[PDB]
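FAQ: What does a ligand-bound record look like?

Like this one, built around 6-nitrobenzotriazole:
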Amino acid sequence: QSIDQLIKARGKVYFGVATDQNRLTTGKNAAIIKADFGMVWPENSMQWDATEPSQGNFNFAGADYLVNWAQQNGKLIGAGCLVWHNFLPSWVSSITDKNTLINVMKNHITTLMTRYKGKIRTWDVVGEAFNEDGSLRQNVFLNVIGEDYIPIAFQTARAADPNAKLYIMDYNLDSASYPKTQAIVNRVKQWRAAGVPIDGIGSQMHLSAGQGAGVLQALPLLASAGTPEVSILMLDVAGASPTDYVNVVNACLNVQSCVGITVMGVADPDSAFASSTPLLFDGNFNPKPAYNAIVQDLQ
Ligand SMILES: O=[N+]([O-])c1ccc2nn[nH]c2c1
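The answer part, i.e. the structure of the complex:
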């Protein structure tokens, strides 16, 4: 049974997965994505180090492969991350002039979003912008541009492709009492009050065992910021307990504005955390107990 087909029948948009060319051409990834998933994100091929390895000079081959495969197979596309501290080339990190970094960041956003204009359902525009205490993370953008970098990124993105849903995403938003969870909500409210076009908050749910239960309180807290959408991103759970995975899926079902769920990969050996067996398919590409538990929960 297809978890994407089932979640759509419950009124959600998709069950998605991160992938890229050389997963699509190996294992049983393409077959499983075709049957069971409704949306794909490039895991790496849209990040800054992959797409703009030197200033103004873009590399599209990998991202084009993913986008084309998705279109050929009738899948929605999410992509990102346009602005975050991960996967950031040293040429960007070196920049000290505010105007220069604003131009660099806007060129990066506009070039990527223009190439794929109208093809991308969801763009993760800003990622990992918060410290664990809820203050803004002192990455190169904050240090050089200041906190306006976030409004500028979103306004630039909206102009480049008005059709895309624009998200901010972060991790450790899994507990409703944690300061980071509270802070992203409070700041997204403020930005949206200033007219900043933040359509979504995405929660990067890289979970430890037993953390599914807390998401039942954290996800509605995230939704209280008033964005039209929220999403679950990068989902994996150490041990892949059915209870953890079902709690996450039910949090999605409970939150009206939660459009869907993206898992970090298909099969355990292809996880960055393979020892923790944290995905829904095993190393022979067979569905695990958590996959079947989600099926039953959604039926
Ligand atoms: O949900 N995802 O797995 C995922 C993976 C990589 C990303 N880059 N930007 N947004 C992403 C979402």
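Follow-up question: can I read anything off the structure? Yes, for example: The radius of gyration is 18 Å.
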